[PDB]
């Protein structure tokens with residue numbers, strides 16, 4: 001009865017802390033030191049954690065959950081009934097675990113080489129080419145080269161990955177892996193909700209897209225941009241065209257109001273990765289939120305090692321499930337983009353610290369998007385010309401309506417452009433998992449969706465054997481993407497709420513929440529819930545209402561919408577890409 005179920009949950013929490021902590025240390029050791037030995041130890045620890053998951057999952061499934069009264073225990077038990085990959089028979093489990101490691105390793109160590117020349121890694125070398133080169137053919141070399149080396153090499157693994165991850169899902173009572181993932185949101189309306197939200201951002205995105213396309217035409221030439229077609233995917237300042245702010249220089253609304261070069265300013269002033277994380281730590285504590293522990297500074301990997309070594313560079317935050325040991329692993333570069341990423345990662349660390357006294361089963365965000373949003377919310381304030389001037393990374397840009405529209409454009413290039421991208425990635429993998437896209441059409445459907453949602457085209461026709469989704473980290477790493485779409489919507493809701501909590505008046509985009517304890521309190525109360533309640537409860541605690549809504553994001557960018565509509569109107573832009581079949585001729 002109730003006593004047996006309460007006891008079970010207590011034993012699960014005790015044992016899980018121990019085994020999860022062991023697994024986390026082995027996983028960290030491989031991620032920060034990719035070798036045969038650390039791979040071997042990780043794959044061994046995979047079997048140890050599966051043994052535990054199987055043991056407790058099997059006992060959990062013997063409880064009739066709806067006979068149980070207490071709702072917190074009902075909830076933990078239902079969750080422990082999901083064995084995830086541990087539902088697989090032993091041979092398939094070992095195969096699956098090896099496939100995942102091989103995909104991660106392949107992505108993380110791929111390089112692109114000039115013939116008889118230097119070989120470039122994604123971080124920082126190719127990322128730097130995409131962000132700074134203004135030459136069509138140099139950008140193409142990097143963009144195609146990365147797909148040829150990373151994308152194509154992932155293809156041999158992906159169909160077996162999909163088979164095994166779906167098999168695990170069905171064994172746990174889902175129809176496929178995507179169903180399994182989406183279930184974390186506990187929102188039956190989720191599909192419709194995401195479509196509605198995507199549609200509300202259309203006026204802003206289509207106008208931003210049309211304006212950017214016009215500027216690219218100006219720079220790259222009339223023979224290379226079709227003003228009524230999709231934009232070549234290598235021209236947007238980012239390897240995946242997911243965020244476009246690195247081409248700010250090409251699209252400045254008011255060039256008479258130029259901004260300080262922020263990378264130059266950071267470097268000349270001796271900014272370092274540690275300083276970047278220290279500044280993030282300060283922002284959190286200014287809100288009354290928790291500082292990271294001394295152990296964090298000892299054990300974190302805040303830059304790429306120099307001791308001849310392979311690591312997974314992609315930025316991540318790590319909970320070691322003992323309530324003390326939290327770490328970030330990031331190949332940090334000294335620039336503004338990575339300052340924002342550092343805040344994002346520190347938001348994950350904050351969430352870990354806030355829910356650390358919950359049972360480990362409930363040590364997650366209210367939904368995964370909440371976990372992604374916390375750091376980004378603070379980074380919105382960090383990004384204001386006010387805050388950046390106070391860091392001496394910008395001159396005084398206060399006052400002018402020119403600098404103001406410029407600032408909004410700079411933010412839009414990341415925040416608005418990302419909405420269709422995150423939607424695309426979500427939809428593609430959804431349809432791979434549900435079987436609507438097979439290995440016969442992985443790449444063709446990727447590009448159909450790239451066109452349909454983002455209005456982008458590949459600069460070079462794709463060929464058989466290309467697997468461009470493989471060249472995006474989250475695909476081989478099997479990290480869900482819907483979280484980021486959700487994050488980008490809700491972070492503006494949170495910003496709007498925290499700003500009114502802090503007593504900001506005037507346009508939302510001028511808000512800076514630095515030092516607001518009232519704002520800190522809203523966040524903390526929500527984060528302390530972890531995964532203990534339906535996510536609308538945490539949304540309510542932060543915002544005073546329970547829905548996901550694009551209205552805050554639209555309010556923030558309202559003055560840019562007006563400016564873009566006027567600008568595009570006078571140039572006669574035809575929004576969208578009615579000439580959707582257009583691709584580059586040369």
Ligand SMILES: *[C@@H]1O[C@H](CO[C@@H]2O[C@@H](C)[C@@H](O)[C@@H](O)[C@@H]2O)[C@@H](O[C@@H]2O[C@H](CO)[C@@H](O[C@@H]3O[C@H](CO)[C@@H](O)[C@H](O)[C@@H]3O)[C@H](O)[C@H]2NC(C)=O)[C@H](O)[C@H]1NC(C)=O
Nearest residue numbers: 005006007008009010069070071072073357358359362532
């Ligand atoms: C349903 O059950 C939950 C969970 O209860 C806890 O875990 C069980 C498996 C058993 O081990 C229980 O002995 C244990 O209480 C109940 O939620 C818990 O309620 C208590 C009492 O309100 C909360 O106590 C707080 O604890 C913090 C310190 O951690 C103090 O600072 C607070 O002042 C306060 O005393 C406890 O946090 C809470 N735990 C969780 C995980 O939610 C719940 O009350 C119960 N429902 C009903 C209707 O009885």
Ligand SMILES: *[C@@H]1O[C@H](CO)[C@@H](O)[C@H](O)[C@H]1NC(C)=O
Nearest residue numbers: 032033035036037038307309
């Ligand atoms: C890297 O890996 C090996 C185990 O393969 C280990 O002996 C060594 O201590 C590790 N090096 C670092 C810098 O962690």
Ligand SMILES: [Cl-]
Nearest residue numbers: 233240468469
């Ligand atoms: Cl691509």
Ligand SMILES: [Cl-]
Nearest residue numbers: 368480482483
């Ligand atoms: Cl997700």
Ligand SMILES: [Zn+2]
Nearest residue numbers: 344348371372
């Ligand atoms: Zn994140």
